[PDB]
Design a binder for this molecule. Sequence first.
Ligand SMILES: Nc1nc2c(ncn2[C@@H]2O[C@H](COP(=O)(O)OP(=O)(O)O)[C@@H](O)[C@H]2O)c(=O)[nH]1
Ligand SMILES: [Mg+2]
Ligand code: NA
Lengths: 168, 91
Amino acid sequence: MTEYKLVVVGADGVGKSALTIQLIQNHFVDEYDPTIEDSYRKQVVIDGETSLLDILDTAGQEEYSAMRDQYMRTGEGFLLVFAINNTKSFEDIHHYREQIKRVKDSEDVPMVLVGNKSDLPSRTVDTKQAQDLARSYGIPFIETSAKTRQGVDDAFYTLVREIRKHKE
Amino acid sequence: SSVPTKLEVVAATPTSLLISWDAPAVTVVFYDITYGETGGNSPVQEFTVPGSKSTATISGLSPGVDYTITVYAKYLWYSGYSSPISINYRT
Ligand SMILES: Nc1nc2c(ncn2[C@@H]2O[C@H](COP(=O)(O)OP(=O)(O)O)[C@@H](O)[C@H]2O)c(=O)[nH]1
Ligand SMILES: [Mg+2]
Ligand code: NA
């Protein structure tokens, strides 16, 4: 059963933890308690393939270690998350794409642009802007809300499909 | 070290500065650079630099003015920012 190492990055408070909890959270006992802080495992079925998702969250600074810094760049695919009511968070997305590519020394890194908090009335970033940016990167753009669960699954599953397309 | 160190003006014109610092060990997605009159009468100006650089150009300053320049590192894999390092420079 294929594993997929997924990393969730973006500015403070855009909802990176919220989207991950909403994707994992159910009404069972949490099937895994990973001992690596801010990691999350969950099995799913995407397009038929029964897959295990190891999801690394952006950790708090109390979790810093040189090894964690190394481990995070081995992620196979990255969610670039911004909040649609937070302009700076969208304006800094390009830094995330640029530097992830740099630290992985790779020209094709599976990536999905994620615009979150789409339930909020205080929009400051236009859907068209995010679509245009995602186009220029040749990556998908998914609009999400961790509050209403809209697009949460589509975001992570699209990232898995992109990892697949990468490995052919 | 988790904080950028050794912030300095490397080169200057009467109205612009080329600043340099040393990167921290923690991986940086971008540096946040702010600059303003040391007094503080006016709001600070701010821009971002890619995490792979440790220099930047500040242009459009006023000559003979005391400026406070401040650098923050935004960690790539961790929430929040480094502590700031700052310097004063008089154009
Ligand atoms: N209305 C709304 N609030 C959200 C959404 N996602 C996160 N939040 C709230 O935004 C705040 C910060 O979210 P958090 O997941 O900690 O952001 P993180 O720092 O990126 O991990 C919390 O109060 C969340 O409850 C969303 O999609 N809609
Ligand atoms: Mg978080
Ligand atoms: Na430097």
